[PDB]
Coordinates of C-alpha atoms (C1' of nucleotides) and ligand atoms in Angstrom, one line a residue:
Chain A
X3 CA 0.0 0.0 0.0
X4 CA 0.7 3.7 -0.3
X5 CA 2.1 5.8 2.7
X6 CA 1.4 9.3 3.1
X7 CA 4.5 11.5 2.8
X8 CA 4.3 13.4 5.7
X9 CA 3.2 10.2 8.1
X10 CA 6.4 8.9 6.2
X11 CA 8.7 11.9 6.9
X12 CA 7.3 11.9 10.5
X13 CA 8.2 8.4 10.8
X14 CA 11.1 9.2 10.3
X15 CA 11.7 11.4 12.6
X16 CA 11.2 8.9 15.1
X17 CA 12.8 5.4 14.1
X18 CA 14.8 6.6 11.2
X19 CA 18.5 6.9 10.9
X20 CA 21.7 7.9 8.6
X21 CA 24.8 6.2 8.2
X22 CA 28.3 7.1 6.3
X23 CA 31.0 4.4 7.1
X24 CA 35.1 5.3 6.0
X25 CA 36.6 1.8 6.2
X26 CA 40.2 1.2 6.0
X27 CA 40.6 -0.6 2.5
X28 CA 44.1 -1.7 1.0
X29 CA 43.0 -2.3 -2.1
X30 CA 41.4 1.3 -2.1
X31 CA 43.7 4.4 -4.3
X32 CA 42.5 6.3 -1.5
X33 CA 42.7 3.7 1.2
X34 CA 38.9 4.2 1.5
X35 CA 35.9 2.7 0.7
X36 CA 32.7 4.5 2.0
X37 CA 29.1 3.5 2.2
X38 CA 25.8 6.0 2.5
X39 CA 23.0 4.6 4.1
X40 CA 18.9 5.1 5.6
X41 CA 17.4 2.5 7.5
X42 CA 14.2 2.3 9.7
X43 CA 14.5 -1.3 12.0
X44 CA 11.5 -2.1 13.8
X45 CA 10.1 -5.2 16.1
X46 CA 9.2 -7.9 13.7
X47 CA 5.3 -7.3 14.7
X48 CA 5.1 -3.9 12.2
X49 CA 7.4 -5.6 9.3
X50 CA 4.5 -3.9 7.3
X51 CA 5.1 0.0 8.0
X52 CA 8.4 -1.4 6.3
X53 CA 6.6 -3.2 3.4
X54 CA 4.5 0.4 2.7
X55 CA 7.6 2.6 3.0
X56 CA 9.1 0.4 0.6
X57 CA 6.7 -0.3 -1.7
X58 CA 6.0 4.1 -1.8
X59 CA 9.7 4.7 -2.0
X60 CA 10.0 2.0 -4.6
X61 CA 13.8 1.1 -3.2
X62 CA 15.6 -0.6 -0.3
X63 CA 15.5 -4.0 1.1
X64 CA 14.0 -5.3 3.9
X65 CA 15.8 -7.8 6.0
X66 CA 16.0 -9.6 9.3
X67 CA 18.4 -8.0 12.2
X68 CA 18.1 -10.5 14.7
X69 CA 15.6 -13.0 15.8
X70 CA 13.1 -10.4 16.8
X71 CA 14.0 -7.3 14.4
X72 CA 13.1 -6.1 10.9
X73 CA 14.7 -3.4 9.0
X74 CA 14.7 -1.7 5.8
X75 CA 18.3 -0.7 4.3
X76 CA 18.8 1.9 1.3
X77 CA 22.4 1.4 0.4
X78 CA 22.5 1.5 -3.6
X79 CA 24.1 5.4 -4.5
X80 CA 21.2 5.8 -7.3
X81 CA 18.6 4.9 -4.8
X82 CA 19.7 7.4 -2.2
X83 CA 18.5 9.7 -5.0
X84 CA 14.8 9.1 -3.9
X85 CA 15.6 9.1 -0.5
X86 CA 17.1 12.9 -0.9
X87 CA 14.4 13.8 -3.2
X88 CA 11.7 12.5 -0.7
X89 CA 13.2 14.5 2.3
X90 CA 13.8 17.9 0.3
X91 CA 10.3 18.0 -0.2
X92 CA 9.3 16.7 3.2
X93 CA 12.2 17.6 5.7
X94 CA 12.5 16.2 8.8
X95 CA 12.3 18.8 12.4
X96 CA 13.8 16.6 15.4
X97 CA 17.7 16.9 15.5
X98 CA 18.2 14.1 13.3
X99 CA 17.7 16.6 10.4
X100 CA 21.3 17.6 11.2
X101 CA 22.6 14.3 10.0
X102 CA 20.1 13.9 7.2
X103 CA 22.2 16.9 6.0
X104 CA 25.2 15.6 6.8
X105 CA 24.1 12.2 4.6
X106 CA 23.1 14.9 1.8
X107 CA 26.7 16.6 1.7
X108 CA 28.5 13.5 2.0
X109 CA 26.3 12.1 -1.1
X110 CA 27.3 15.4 -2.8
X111 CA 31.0 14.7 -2.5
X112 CA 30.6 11.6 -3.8
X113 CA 28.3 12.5 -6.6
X114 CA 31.1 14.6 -7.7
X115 CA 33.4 11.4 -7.3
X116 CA 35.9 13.5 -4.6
X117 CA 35.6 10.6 -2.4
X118 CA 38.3 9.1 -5.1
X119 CA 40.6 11.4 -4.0
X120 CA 42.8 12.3 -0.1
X121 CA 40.9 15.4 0.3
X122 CA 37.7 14.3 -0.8
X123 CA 38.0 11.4 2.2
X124 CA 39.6 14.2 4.5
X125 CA 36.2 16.3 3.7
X126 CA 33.9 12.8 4.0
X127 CA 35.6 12.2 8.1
X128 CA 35.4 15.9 8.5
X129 CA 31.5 15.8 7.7
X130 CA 31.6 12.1 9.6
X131 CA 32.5 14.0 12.8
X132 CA 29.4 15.7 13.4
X133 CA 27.5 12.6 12.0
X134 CA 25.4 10.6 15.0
X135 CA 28.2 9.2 17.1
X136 CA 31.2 10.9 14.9
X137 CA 34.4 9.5 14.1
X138 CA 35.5 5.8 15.2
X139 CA 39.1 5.5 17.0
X140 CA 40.7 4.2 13.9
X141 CA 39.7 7.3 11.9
X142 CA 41.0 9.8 14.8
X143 CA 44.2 8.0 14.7
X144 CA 44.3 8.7 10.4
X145 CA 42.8 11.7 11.2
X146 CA 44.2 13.2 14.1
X147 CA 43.9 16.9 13.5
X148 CA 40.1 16.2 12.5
X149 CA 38.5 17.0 15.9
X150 CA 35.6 19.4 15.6
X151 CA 32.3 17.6 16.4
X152 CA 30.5 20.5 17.4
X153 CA 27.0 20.7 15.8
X154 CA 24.2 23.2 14.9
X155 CA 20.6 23.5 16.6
X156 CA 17.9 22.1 14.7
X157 CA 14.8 24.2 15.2
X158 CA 11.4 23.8 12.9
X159 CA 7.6 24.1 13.5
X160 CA 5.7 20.8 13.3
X161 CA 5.5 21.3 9.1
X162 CA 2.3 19.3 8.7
X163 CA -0.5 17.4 10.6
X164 CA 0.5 14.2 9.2
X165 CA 3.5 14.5 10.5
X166 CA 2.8 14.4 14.4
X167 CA 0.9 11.3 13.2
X168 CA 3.7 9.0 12.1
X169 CA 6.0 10.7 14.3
X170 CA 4.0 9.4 17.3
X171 CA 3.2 5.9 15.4
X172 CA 6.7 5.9 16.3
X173 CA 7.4 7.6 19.7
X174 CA 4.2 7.6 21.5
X175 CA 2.2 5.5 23.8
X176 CA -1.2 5.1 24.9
X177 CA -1.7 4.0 28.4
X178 CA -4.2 3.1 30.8
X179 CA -2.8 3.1 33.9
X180 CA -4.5 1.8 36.7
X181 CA -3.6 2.8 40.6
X182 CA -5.0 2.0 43.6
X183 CA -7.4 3.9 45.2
X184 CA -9.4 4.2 48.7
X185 CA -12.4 3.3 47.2
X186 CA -14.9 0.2 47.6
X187 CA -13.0 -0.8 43.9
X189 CA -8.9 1.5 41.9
X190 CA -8.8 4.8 39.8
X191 CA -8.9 4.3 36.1
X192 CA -6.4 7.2 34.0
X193 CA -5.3 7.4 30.4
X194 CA -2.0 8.5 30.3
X195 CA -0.7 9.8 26.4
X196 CA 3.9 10.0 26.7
X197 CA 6.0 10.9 24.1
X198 CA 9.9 10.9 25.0
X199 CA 12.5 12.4 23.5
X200 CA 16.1 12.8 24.2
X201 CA 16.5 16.6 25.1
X202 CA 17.6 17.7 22.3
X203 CA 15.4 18.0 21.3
X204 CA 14.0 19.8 24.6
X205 CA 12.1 22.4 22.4
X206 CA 9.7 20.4 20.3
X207 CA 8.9 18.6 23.1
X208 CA 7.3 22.1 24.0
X209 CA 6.0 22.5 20.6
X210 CA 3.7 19.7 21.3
X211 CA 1.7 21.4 24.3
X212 CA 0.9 24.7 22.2
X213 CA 0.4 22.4 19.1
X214 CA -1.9 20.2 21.1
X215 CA -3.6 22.5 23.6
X216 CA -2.8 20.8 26.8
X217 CA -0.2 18.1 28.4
X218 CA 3.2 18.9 30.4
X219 CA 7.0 18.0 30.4
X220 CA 8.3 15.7 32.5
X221 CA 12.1 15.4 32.9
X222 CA 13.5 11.3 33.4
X223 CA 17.2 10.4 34.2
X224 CA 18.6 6.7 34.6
X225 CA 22.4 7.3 35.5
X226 CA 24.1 9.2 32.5
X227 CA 21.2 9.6 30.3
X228 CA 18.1 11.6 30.5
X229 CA 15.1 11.9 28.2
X230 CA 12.2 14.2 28.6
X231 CA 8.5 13.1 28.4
X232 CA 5.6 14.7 27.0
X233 CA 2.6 13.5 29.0
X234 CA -1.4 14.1 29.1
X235 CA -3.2 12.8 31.8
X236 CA -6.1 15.4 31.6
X237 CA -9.5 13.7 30.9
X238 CA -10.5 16.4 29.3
X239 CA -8.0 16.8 26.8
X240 CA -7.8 13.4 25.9
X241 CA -11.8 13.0 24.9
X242 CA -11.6 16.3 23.3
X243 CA -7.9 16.7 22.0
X244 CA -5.7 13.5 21.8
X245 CA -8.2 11.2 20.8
X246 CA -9.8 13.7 18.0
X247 CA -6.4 14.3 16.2
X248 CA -5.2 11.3 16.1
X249 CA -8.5 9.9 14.9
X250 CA -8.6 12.6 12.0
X251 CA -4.8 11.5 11.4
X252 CA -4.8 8.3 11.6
X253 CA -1.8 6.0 12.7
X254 CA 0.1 3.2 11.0
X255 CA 1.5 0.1 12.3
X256 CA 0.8 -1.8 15.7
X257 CA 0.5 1.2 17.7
X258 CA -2.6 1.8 16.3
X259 CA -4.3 -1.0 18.0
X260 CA -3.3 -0.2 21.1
X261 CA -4.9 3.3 20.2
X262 CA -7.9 1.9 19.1
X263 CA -8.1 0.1 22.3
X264 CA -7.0 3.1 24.2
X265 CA -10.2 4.8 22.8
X266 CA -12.4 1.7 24.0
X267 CA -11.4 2.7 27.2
X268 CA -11.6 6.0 27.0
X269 CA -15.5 5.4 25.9
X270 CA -16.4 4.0 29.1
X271 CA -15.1 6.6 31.1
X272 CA -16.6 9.2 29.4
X273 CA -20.1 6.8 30.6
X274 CA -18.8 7.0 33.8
X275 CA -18.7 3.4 33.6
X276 CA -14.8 2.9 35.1
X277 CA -16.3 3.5 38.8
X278 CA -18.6 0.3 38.5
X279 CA -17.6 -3.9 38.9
X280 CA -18.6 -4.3 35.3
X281 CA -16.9 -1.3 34.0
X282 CA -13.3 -2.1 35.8
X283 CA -13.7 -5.6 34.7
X284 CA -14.2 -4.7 31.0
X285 CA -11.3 -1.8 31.3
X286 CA -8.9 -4.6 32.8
X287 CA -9.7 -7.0 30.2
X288 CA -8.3 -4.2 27.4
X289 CA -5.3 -2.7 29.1
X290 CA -4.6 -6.4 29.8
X291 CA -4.8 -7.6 26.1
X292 CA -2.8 -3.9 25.2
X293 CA 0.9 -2.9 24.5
X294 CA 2.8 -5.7 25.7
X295 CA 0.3 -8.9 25.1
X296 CA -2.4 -8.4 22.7
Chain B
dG1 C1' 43.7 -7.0 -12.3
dG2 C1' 42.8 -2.9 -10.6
dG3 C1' 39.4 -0.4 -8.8
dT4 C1' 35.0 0.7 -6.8
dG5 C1' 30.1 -0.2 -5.6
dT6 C1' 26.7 -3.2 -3.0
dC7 C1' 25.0 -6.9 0.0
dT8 C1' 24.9 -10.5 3.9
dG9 C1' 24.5 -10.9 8.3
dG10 C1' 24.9 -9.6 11.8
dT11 C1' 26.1 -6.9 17.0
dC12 C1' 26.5 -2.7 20.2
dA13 C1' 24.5 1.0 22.7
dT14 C1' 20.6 3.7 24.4
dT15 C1' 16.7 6.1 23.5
dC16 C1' 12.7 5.1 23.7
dT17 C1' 8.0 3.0 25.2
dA18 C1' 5.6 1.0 29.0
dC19 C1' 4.9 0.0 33.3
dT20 C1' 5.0 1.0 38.8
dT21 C1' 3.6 3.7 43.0
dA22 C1' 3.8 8.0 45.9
dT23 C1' 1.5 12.1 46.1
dT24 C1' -1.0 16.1 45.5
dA25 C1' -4.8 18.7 43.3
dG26 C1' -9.8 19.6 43.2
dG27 C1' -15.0 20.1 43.0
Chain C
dC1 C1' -14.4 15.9 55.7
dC2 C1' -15.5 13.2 51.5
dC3 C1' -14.2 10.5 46.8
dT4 C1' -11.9 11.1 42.5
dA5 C1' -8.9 13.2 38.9
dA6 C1' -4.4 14.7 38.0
dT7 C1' 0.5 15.3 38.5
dA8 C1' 4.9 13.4 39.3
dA9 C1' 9.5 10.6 40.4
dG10 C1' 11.2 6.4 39.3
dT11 C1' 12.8 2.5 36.8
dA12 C1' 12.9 -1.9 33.5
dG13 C1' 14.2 -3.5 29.4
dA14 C1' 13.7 -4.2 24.8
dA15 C1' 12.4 -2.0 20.6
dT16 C1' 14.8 1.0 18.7
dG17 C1' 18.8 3.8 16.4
dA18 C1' 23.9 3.3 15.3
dC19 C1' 27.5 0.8 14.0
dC20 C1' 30.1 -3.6 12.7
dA21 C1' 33.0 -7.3 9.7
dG22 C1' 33.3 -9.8 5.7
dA23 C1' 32.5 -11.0 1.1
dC24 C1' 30.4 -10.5 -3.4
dA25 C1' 29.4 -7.9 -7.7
dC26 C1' 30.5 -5.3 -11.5
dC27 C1' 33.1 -2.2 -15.2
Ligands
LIG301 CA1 13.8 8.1 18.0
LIG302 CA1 8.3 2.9 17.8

DNA sequence: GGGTGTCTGGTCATTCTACTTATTAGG
DNA sequence: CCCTAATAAGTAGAATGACCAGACACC
């Protein structure tokens, strides 16, 4: 099937990424071979988002990574070509635009063949450094006066409703938590998170004004930290979260677990998630939600 | 006979998702 | 007071993102 471009772009955003590898080569006149690559790799479970994005881009392969892991691989220099094309006219807005463009000028360089030549590699490491995790040891050794991985701040408006939709087909959740109470039952809440490392710390702001409601929360586990993007408000979820993403619809598993998410969110609105039968049918679909189904 | 582009088949590292429970906010 | 909705800190762990080695393919 066909996939929207901007779902497609706002995919991306989420589980895409861009790779540029400089391998030592013997056999190479520059010592150098280099590879471009995009790839999305997802849980085997929505091996169809990668059959649409696929069969819309018309290139890449999809493969196994693992037992439990799927991904689709564009590799082949012409087929890059649509990739560029694709993201020109729907860029990407999280950070990871930086190293789209850093995938772009590396695929210049090599359009114009300089990656057959000592400066056109020196260039290739040089645009490398600020790509994702930068240079390997190996290169820094070659390369040793090659050393600044400083970047630039990404900064964009959410570009097009579709976009929030396949960015959160990839980032979001919907949740129904369910906490004890002093009650004769148990309180029933729907919980909508997005995270995001902070980075991109500003379009996780973007999302309240762009939504109308929800808050920030700040998580750390040792070293790393992401921020979440949280709405917990009944309110805003009957009238707000579930309306958009209804008009923009998802792609993938996680739309399941929204359309369960919404089940739930029906009987609450009938005040039906204070009585037995209510919590019983509420457990059964959080139960048979996310992880199980 | 170089020389370069592309694929096979992965693994490594962490940013995501998803799940807990304490606690306060509120009509 | 009540009974309930809403915010919040915290973490687990695997689905992500990023990188890896080797060999094949082609002009
Ligand atoms: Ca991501
Ligand atoms: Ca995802």
């Amino acid at each position: 099937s066909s996939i929207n471009p901007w779902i497609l772009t706002g995919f991306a955003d989420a589980e895409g990424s861009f790779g540029l590898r400089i391998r030592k080569r013997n056999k190479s006149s520059v010592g150098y071979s280099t590879e471009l690559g995009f790839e999305i790799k997802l849980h085997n479970k929505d091996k169809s988002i990668l059959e649409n994005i696929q069969s819309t881009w018309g290139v890449g392969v999809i493969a196994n990574s693992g037992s439990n892991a799927v991904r689709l691989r564009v590799t082949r220099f012409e087929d890059l070509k649509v990739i560029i094309d694709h993201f020109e006219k729907y860029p990407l807005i999280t950070q990871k635009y930086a190293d789209y463009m850093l995938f772009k000028q590396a695929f210049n360089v090599m359009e114009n063949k300089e990656h057959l030549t000592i400066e056109g590699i020196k260039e290739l490491v040089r645009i490398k450094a600020k790509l994702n995790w930068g240079l390997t040891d190996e290169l820094k050794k070659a390369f040793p006066e090659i050393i600044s991985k400083e970047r630039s701040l990404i900064n964009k408006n959410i570009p097009n409703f579709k976009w929030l939709a396949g960015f959160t087909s990839g980032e979001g959740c919907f949740f129904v938590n369910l906490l004890k109470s002093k009650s004769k039952l148990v309180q029933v809440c729907l919980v909508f998170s997005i995270g995001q490392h902070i980075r991109d710390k500003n379009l996780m702001n973007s999302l309240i004004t762009y939504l109308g409601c929800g808050y920030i929360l700040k998580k750390n586990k040792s070293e790393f930290s992401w921020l979440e993007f949280c709405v917990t408000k009944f309110s805003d979820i009957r009238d707000k979260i579930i309306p958009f993403f209804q008009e923009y619809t998802l792609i993938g598993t996680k739309l399941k677990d929204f359309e369960d998410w919404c089940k739930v969110a029906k009987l609450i609105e009938e005040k039906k998630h204070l009585t037995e039968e209510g919590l019983d049918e509420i457990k059964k679909i959080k139960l048979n939600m996310n992880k199980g189904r």
